[PDB]
Amino acid sequence: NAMKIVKRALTFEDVLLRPGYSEVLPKEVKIHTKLTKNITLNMPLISAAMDTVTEHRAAIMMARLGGLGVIHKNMDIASQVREVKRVKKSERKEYPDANKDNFGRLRVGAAIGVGQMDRVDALVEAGVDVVVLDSAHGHSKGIIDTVKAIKAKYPNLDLIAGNIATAAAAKALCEAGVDAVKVGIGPGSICTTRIVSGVGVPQISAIDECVEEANKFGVPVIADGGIKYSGDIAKALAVGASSVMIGSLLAGTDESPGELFTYQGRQYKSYRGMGSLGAMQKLVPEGIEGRVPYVGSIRSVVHQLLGGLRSSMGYVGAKDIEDFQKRAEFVEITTAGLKESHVHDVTITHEAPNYK
Amino acid sequence: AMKIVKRALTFEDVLLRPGYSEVLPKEVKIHTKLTKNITLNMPLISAAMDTVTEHRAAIMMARLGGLGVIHKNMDIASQVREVKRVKKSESPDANKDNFGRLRVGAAIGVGQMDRVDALVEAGVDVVVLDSAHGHSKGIIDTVKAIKAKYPNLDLIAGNIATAAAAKALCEAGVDAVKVGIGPGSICTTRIVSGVGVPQISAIDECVEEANKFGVPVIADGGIKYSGDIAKALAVGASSVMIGSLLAGTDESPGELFTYQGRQYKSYRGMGSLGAMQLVPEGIEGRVPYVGSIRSVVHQLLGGLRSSMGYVGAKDIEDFQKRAEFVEITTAGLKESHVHDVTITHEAPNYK
Amino acid sequence: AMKIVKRALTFEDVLLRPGYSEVLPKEVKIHTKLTKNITLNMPLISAAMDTVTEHRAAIMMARLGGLGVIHKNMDIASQVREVKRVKKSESGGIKDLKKRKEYPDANKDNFGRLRVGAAIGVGQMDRVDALVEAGVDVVVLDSAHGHSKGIIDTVKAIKAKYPNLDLIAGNIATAAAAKALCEAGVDAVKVGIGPGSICTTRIVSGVGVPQISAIDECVEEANKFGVPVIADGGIKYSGDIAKALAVGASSVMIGSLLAGTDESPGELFTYQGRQYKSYRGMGSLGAMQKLVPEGIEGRVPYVGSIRSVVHQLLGGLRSSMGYVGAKDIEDFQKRAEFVEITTAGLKESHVHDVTITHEAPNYK
Amino acid sequence: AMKIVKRALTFEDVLLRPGYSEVLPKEVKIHTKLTKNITLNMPLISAAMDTVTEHRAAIMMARLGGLGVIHKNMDIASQVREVKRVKKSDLKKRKEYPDANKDNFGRLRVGAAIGVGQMDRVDALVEAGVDVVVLDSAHGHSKGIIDTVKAIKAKYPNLDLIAGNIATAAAAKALCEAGVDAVKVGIGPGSICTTRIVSGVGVPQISAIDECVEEANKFGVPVIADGGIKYSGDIAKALAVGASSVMIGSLLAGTDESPGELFTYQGRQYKSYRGMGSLGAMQKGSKLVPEGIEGRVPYVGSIRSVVHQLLGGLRSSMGYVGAKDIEDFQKRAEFVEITTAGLKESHVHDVTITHEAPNYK
Ligand SMILES: CC(C)(NC(=O)Nc1ccc(Cl)cc1)c1cccc(C(=N)NO)c1
Ligand SMILES: CC(C)(NC(=O)Nc1ccc(Cl)cc1)c1cccc(C(=N)NO)c1
Ligand SMILES: CC(C)(NC(=O)Nc1ccc(Cl)cc1)c1cccc(C(=N)NO)c1
Numbered sequence A: 001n002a003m004k005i006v007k008r009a010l011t012f013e014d015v016l017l018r019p020g021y022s023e024v025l026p027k028e029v030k031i032h033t034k035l036t037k038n039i040t041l042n043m044p045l046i047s048a049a050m051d052t053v054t055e056h057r058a059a060i061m062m063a064r065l066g067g068l069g070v071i072h073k074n075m076d077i078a079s080q081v082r083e084v085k086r087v088k089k090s091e092r093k094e095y096p097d098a099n100k101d102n103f104g105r106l107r108v109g110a111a112i113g114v115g116q117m118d119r120v121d122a123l124v125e126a127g128v129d130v131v132v133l134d135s136a137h138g139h140s141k142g143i144i145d146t147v148k149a150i151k152a153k154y155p156n157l158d159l160i161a162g163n164i165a166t167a168a169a170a171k172a173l174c175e176a177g178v179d180a181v182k183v184g185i186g187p188g189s190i191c192t193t194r195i196v197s198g199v200g201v202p203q204i205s206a207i208d209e210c211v212e213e214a215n216k217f218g219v220p221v222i223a224d225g226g227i228k229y230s231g232d233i234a235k236a237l238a239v240g241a242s243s244v245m246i247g248s249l250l251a252g253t254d255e256s257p258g259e260l261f262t263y264q265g266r267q268y269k270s271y272r273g274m275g276s277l278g279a280m281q282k283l284v285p286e287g288i289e290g291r292v293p294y295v296g297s298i299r300s301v302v303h304q305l306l307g308g309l310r311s312s313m314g315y316v317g318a319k320d321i322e323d324f325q326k327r328a329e330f331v332e333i334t335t336a337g338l339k340e341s342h343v344h345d346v347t348i349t350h351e352a353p354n355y356k
Numbered sequence B: 001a002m003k004i005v006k007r008a009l010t011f012e013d014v015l016l017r018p019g020y021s022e023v024l025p026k027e028v029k030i031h032t033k034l035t036k037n038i039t040l041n042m043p044l045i046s047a048a049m050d051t052v053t054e055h056r057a058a059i060m061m062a063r064l065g066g067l068g069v070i071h072k073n074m075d076i077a078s079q080v081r082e083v084k085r086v087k088k089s090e091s092p093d094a095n096k097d098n099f100g101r102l103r104v105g106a107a108i109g110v111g112q113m114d115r116v117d118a119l120v121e122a123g124v125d126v127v128v129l130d131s132a133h134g135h136s137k138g139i140i141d142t143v144k145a146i147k148a149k150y151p152n153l154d155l156i157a158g159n160i161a162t163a164a165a166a167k168a169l170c171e172a173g174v175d176a177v178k179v180g181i182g183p184g185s186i187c188t189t190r191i192v193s194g195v196g197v198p199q200i201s202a203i204d205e206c207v208e209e210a211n212k213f214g215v216p217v218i219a220d221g222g223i224k225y226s227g228d229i230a231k232a233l234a235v236g237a238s239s240v241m242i243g244s245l246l247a248g249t250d251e252s253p254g255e256l257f258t259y260q261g262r263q264y265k266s267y268r269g270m271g272s273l274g275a276m277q278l279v280p281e282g283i284e285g286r287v288p289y290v291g292s293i294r295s296v297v298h299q300l301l302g303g304l305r306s307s308m309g310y311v312g313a314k315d316i317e318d319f320q321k322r323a324e325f326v327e328i329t330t331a332g333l334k335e336s337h338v339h340d341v342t343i344t345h346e347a348p349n350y351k
Numbered sequence C: 001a002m003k004i005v006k007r008a009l010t011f012e013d014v015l016l017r018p019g020y021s022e023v024l025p026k027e028v029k030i031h032t033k034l035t036k037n038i039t040l041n042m043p044l045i046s047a048a049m050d051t052v053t054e055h056r057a058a059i060m061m062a063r064l065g066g067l068g069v070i071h072k073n074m075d076i077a078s079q080v081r082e083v084k085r086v087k088k089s090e091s092g093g094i095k096d097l098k099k100r101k102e103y104p105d106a107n108k109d110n111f112g113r114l115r116v117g118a119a120i121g122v123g124q125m126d127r128v129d130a131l132v133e134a135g136v137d138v139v140v141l142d143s144a145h146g147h148s149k150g151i152i153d154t155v156k157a158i159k160a161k162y163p164n165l166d167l168i169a170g171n172i173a174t175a176a177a178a179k180a181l182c183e184a185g186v187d188a189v190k191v192g193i194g195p196g197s198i199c200t201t202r203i204v205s206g207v208g209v210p211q212i213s214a215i216d217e218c219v220e221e222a223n224k225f226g227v228p229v230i231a232d233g234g235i236k237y238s239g240d241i242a243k244a245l246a247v248g249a250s251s252v253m254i255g256s257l258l259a260g261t262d263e264s265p266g267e268l269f270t271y272q273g274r275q276y277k278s279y280r281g282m283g284s285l286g287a288m289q290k291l292v293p294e295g296i297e298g299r300v301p302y303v304g305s306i307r308s309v310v311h312q313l314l315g316g317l318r319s320s321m322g323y324v325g326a327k328d329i330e331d332f333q334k335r336a337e338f339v340e341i342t343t344a345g346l347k348e349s350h351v352h353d354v355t356i357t358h359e360a361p362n363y364k
Numbered sequence D: 001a002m003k004i005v006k007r008a009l010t011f012e013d014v015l016l017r018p019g020y021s022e023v024l025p026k027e028v029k030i031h032t033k034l035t036k037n038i039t040l041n042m043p044l045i046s047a048a049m050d051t052v053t054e055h056r057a058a059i060m061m062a063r064l065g066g067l068g069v070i071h072k073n074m075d076i077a078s079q080v081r082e083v084k085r086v087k088k089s090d091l092k093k094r095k096e097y098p099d100a101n102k103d104n105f106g107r108l109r110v111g112a113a114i115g116v117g118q119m120d121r122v123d124a125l126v127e128a129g130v131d132v133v134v135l136d137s138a139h140g141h142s143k144g145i146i147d148t149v150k151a152i153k154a155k156y157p158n159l160d161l162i163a164g165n166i167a168t169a170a171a172a173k174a175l176c177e178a179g180v181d182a183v184k185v186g187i188g189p190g191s192i193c194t195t196r197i198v199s200g201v202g203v204p205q206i207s208a209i210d211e212c213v214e215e216a217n218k219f220g221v222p223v224i225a226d227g228g229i230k231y232s233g234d235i236a237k238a239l240a241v242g243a244s245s246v247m248i249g250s251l252l253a254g255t256d257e258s259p260g261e262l263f264t265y266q267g268r269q270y271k272s273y274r275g276m277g278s279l280g281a282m283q284k285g286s287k288l289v290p291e292g293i294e295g296r297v298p299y300v301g302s303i304r305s306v307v308h309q310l311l312g313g314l315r316s317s318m319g320y321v322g323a324k325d326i327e328d329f330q331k332r333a334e335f336v337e338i339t340t341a342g343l344k345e346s347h348v349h350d351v352t353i354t355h356e357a358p359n360y361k
């Protein structure tokens, strides 16, 4: 065969975690983790850098709950600075797991593009905790040059770069000096990249390959995109990602940007790809414009997502994420296994808060 | 370097090969072991769910030769009453104790020794120790406490889905292990937590280990059609536990209701919000009304008899020794169902 | 430690690779063998079902060059009457010039009478005797489970009593079963446990073998005895006929594609301003009212005459043989190379991304 | 036992892996070979179908850098007339179409389909100035095709000749040895095609391209991947596998330029789209049973807007792979095989689409 097929790649729906002997209840497990080599999270969730997901309200709530929000970059420098500053002056025992810097202020992230040094300058002055250098194709000279230039001017600024989906890409970014890599080419709910360009790696195999390489450098992996249910968070972490970035599951909350609207008797919010026409008009598109149901507060969403993670860790018998990653074992399943895993042969009559 | 230990299969992935047969479906024998010490005349058990089994369903299961497990979503006195109703019902296939009284089971959870005490005094035949995660310190310590206090009480524990878990429960002294993490029709465990094992591979793995102890395996959850029962027993389960196929019956708890011109009964997971009243592991639903348990069980056991006839098996143990499987594809599964023809008459065993 | 023999494939899992061809579809030969002793001029048999084959359908199947098998869900006198109607439709001494010009490929016995088959069950020796006396050309011994003592004993009794009667027996799905029936003296084995459109056996009993692998395994054993294999059930499209024959079947038995025709028994009816005929498994409750059912009761769209259906089915086979370069069915089996496909490959193979606005005569 | 040669994959079974890139999508080169002797500025060819390509579609495809193939479901004189219209096709146009695919005289290039043994048709198309003849059969790997290739190359040594369709390495070898200038690969993948269902014959398109490219490269002969392209990503996969150009039917059938009528049905505009082996197409020509259907596709506007989106997807793909040009694309490309769940992850999922996207239906 002329064509080079390197592996058969799996994603979340193709695998399940095996139960393990457990001496710990879900409410007892520890779910803190690392965002970067130098920044910890108290809970492993990050809200996506998207203009229908994270501005200051979402970033504040995510940090209060122990995680992180990344302010999107589809705004001018001054507006983004204003958003970072609003998170940073936000700060109450209602939030005992709040993720704070050494001064007691909430952590926040902010996204940047290739070559946007003036923006990096402004965000550093505004007190940003981590810069997220994002591009459709992180394994690129433009990205690596920007990494090198930022770490040369701000040696102690935590820098996350992405997105990537190969071991070669993880090595290249780790060698350029990043503090974490963000993995995900194509898995996003609103993403058409794989369909429009033919490029991508199914998300489980992409995490697995990139974690194996990035661990050789001590660099955490953020699993970005494709999370549909709380069970997918556990699988992403068990394969070895240090944290998970989520868009669609948070787009429908009070705190995300944009107003509620009603369609056919039910309430929704807009949710769209940053590579969709609408977002780019604020080169051919790699995302769509859509809607997601309204699901209330980020707090109630996060409670269900982490409840599922805790249940998963109790089933596996892990006391914390490190132990979860060391001892998780998987089985590969079939299409019929997946059908068996969902609800089947019964008509759901009541909504469940964690299953749609 | 992720640890995938196995490609795991479930019911729809496999079929039984026919073998040379000298037996007609009429003639095969379908008795089996529930526990090390209790035999069933038919290998079907109704699920311990508050939309499936109270006394009326348990009575009919035992009269037909199997067993009902009274659910534990009720206080102790209520469950004792349900047990006494079944034992008091009477005193050719009926599953009876040494006094001519129907046999019945009853579910308990961890740290419920007072419920065990009352159920034993009420004459329960078997206690079913029921957890979302059987392979845990709480369950193992509860098994050891029950067997130390009641050496001669048959104890079933679950649920599990690995060889290591079957070993642990068998070493602690259970009389049967119940296998099934995630296969249930109303179950969302695998979606909410990412954990589970497709039911065929889980039975296969647990049987191999439990056989070392002479301990039967109960295949719990995921049975959709009667062929699923045949497959589970052929792989080596000694009995099968069924929820959804029995919940739309006259005998299950709860009332008929009508929706869009046709009748239903509620059916819900014991880890759904409704049953527990939180991060649920089940949903609340409805199933079509299908008449009496008698007519359902007749169809289910009819399928099992046909299967044993096709395989040439005189009885369950011979069925397990003779069974050979093929793995099939999605195209093979579509070929197996009805295809390319519009069904006009609802068929008593295929829906 | 559960014993999985193999991964088994059915029609939609495979495709034939094109091969170098020097023949056009109108030039290929499609005659074949029904049994060791009976030839067909085309490779199609209508199912022994009370919604498919009674005398009218059997007369048409024979005129077109194949065979019809009269079902057995009737008393002996009624099945004799059906067989005689086929045997008396035509004869060597009656020069029906119309029928002889329209149907030049008609499949006839040595007296110039249309051939016909008839179904029997285990131990129905009285029915066999009456069918022989009626002039039946081949007896089809049907059971849900051909690989059984009851069937093998029936085969040995029939072959002892009528050594020259061609006898088909089924249904089977393993090589061991084919070996057992061939050693017992059958003239052809009929393969298919579970593939039928109206069949629920695999779902109700968990027992079956996907049809391509089942044919493949039984052909390899039956060929050792010179015994033809009949692929019975699960044919959805003309391409499935080609695949079945290419894998090694000598003929194919079809139910649902022939049930909605003028010639099948049963009356046209209308559902929501559309015409249908009934089509039901012989193991359905309706058919058995005459233990738990192994089929359903259904309807299929009315499609006109058996002639236009068969014309399309054989046109697809001829095309297939042209693509392989096969001059005849045995050449087809010796040339044929398959590929295994995926789910996406099956999607690609069907019509996709286009709304169909006209009925194609061979694609529904 | 039966002989299964391999497990065959098509477009939805595979994805391209990203590679290290120093190039942006607007900088990559998408020039490619049509035959041994003719190049395209862009690798797209409109299908030789009577609902896709007559002179108007061929003019636009050539103006955008590719090619149109005039279908053969018409008499010789009608097909000569369509070819002449393209060849007869002001100085502003040269500004607006700076990538036009022209012959030596500055006329738009055009192809035309012929059938087995149709030497009279070849003679008339050559005198009309056709740039390439596409010898097309349902079954290219046949004595009839092979003898016609030989007779055409004997009589017109300098006429570029594409032959198809094929799906195996043995077939590419036979056509290359008989002297074709490109082979066209595709048995069964077409949107409107029922060949694999009617006859059971075919090879999933990715494996078919891959097998034919390996053999045809030994003769320096380009492969045209014909059929089954649903999205722009499929074009990228086909080229990365080793195809030199891609032939497109359904994605161009609902354009202004395709022949046949815009009509409205239930508030939406469509155009007819049908297989050349459908009953309607063959009754036009007027015996073999059909190997295609008759349908309709939504109206999508101009060919230019469609082509812009398709090539934008190709450029993006080459940027992800790090490829500066098509040959570099093919050398660098590495694939993964995916599952049905992988394909579901790849599409839009768990969100309702509320706005039209120009490259994703
Ligand atoms: C602009 C657009 C539509 N596409 C690209 O920039 N494509 C792209 C860029 C570089 C290379 Cl070498 C190849 C392709 C975009 C915008 C915002 C987000 C994304 C996205 N896919 N994020 O994950 C994409
Ligand atoms: C309560 C709830 C919703 N979940 C759990 O208890 N989860 C759970 C328990 C222990 C551990 Cl270590 C991990 C997870 C439940 C209630 C009833 C039944 C089930 C069920 N999954 N099978 O019966 C679950
Ligand atoms: C009666 C019924 C419903 N089932 C059986 O007779 N079952 C059966 C027979 C023997 C053995 Cl050992 C095992 C199972 C039936 C009637 C007519 C046709 C079929 C059928 N499956 N044909 O392919 C089945």
Ligand SMILES: CC(C)(NC(=O)Nc1ccc(Cl)cc1)c1cccc(C(=N)NO)c1
Residues within 6 Å of the ligand: C021, C023, C024, C025, C319, C320, C322, C323, D137, D138, D139, D142, D165, D195, D276, D277, D278, D288, D289, D290, D291, D292
């Ligand atoms: C006419 C028809 C329906 N079929 C054939 O000509 N079949 C065919 C020809 C030769 C051989 Cl040896 C085998 C089969 C057709 C018409 C137009 C296009 C096609 C088609 N499949 N193109 O790819 C087919």
Ligand SMILES: O=c1[nH]cnc2c1ncn2[C@@H]1O[C@H](COP(=O)(O)O)[C@@H](O)[C@H]1O
Residues within 6 Å of the ligand: A048, A049, A050, A163, A184, A186, A187, A188, A189, A190, A191, A192, A193, A224, A225, A226, A227, A245, A246, A247, A248, A249, A272, A273, A274, A275, A276, A286, A287, A288
């Ligand atoms: O339009 C785009 N094209 C491709 N990927 C995108 C686009 N916009 C956002 N993303 C990615 O999709 C992720 C969200 O995935 P989700 O959680 O599945 O909704 C984000 O964190 C980005 O990495």
Ligand SMILES: O=c1[nH]cnc2c1ncn2[C@@H]1O[C@H](COP(=O)(O)O)[C@@H](O)[C@H]1O
Residues within 6 Å of the ligand: B047, B048, B049, B159, B180, B182, B183, B184, B185, B186, B187, B188, B189, B220, B221, B222, B223, B241, B242, B243, B244, B245, B268, B269, B270, B271, B272, B281, B282, B283
């Ligand atoms: O809500 C729950 N979550 C997970 N599993 C459940 C829940 N409730 C009942 N089950 C299991 O599902 C089985 C019934 O499955 P069914 O026969 O497929 O409907 C029961 O016997 C239990 O083992």
Ligand SMILES: O=c1[nH]cnc2c1ncn2[C@@H]1O[C@H](COP(=O)(O)O)[C@@H](O)[C@H]1O
Residues within 6 Å of the ligand: C047, C048, C049, C171, C192, C194, C195, C196, C197, C198, C199, C200, C201, C232, C233, C234, C235, C253, C254, C255, C256, C257, C280, C281, C282, C283, C284, C294, C295, C296
């Ligand atoms: O009810 C039944 N159960 C199982 N198989 C049946 C039954 N009735 C007929 N068959 C088989 O199904 C075949 C027809 O399949 P079809 O062509 O796919 O509809 C017949 O030739 C029989 O072998």
Ligand SMILES: O=c1[nH]cnc2c1ncn2[C@@H]1O[C@H](COP(=O)(O)O)[C@@H](O)[C@H]1O
Residues within 6 Å of the ligand: D047, D048, D049, D165, D186, D188, D189, D190, D191, D192, D193, D194, D195, D226, D227, D228, D229, D247, D248, D249, D250, D251, D274, D275, D276, D277, D278, D291, D292, D293
């Ligand atoms: O009716 C037919 N039967 C089979 N293939 C056809 C027929 N008509 C056109 N084709 C092929 O299908 C291709 C178009 O496929 P599409 O781009 O997927 O719509 C054409 O270029 C031909 O190769």
Ligand SMILES: [K+]
Residues within 6 Å of the ligand: A340, A341, A342, A343, A344, B182, B183, B184, B185, B186, B187, B188
């Ligand atoms: K489930």
Ligand SMILES: [K+]
Residues within 6 Å of the ligand: B335, B336, B337, B338, B339, C194, C195, C196, C197, C198, C199, C200, C201
């Ligand atoms: K079937």
Ligand SMILES: [K+]
Residues within 6 Å of the ligand: C348, C349, C350, C351, C352, D188, D189, D190, D191, D192, D193, D194, D195
């Ligand atoms: K097709």
Ligand SMILES: [K+]
Residues within 6 Å of the ligand: A186, A187, A188, A189, A190, A191, A192, A193, D345, D346, D347, D348, D349
């Ligand atoms: K996607």
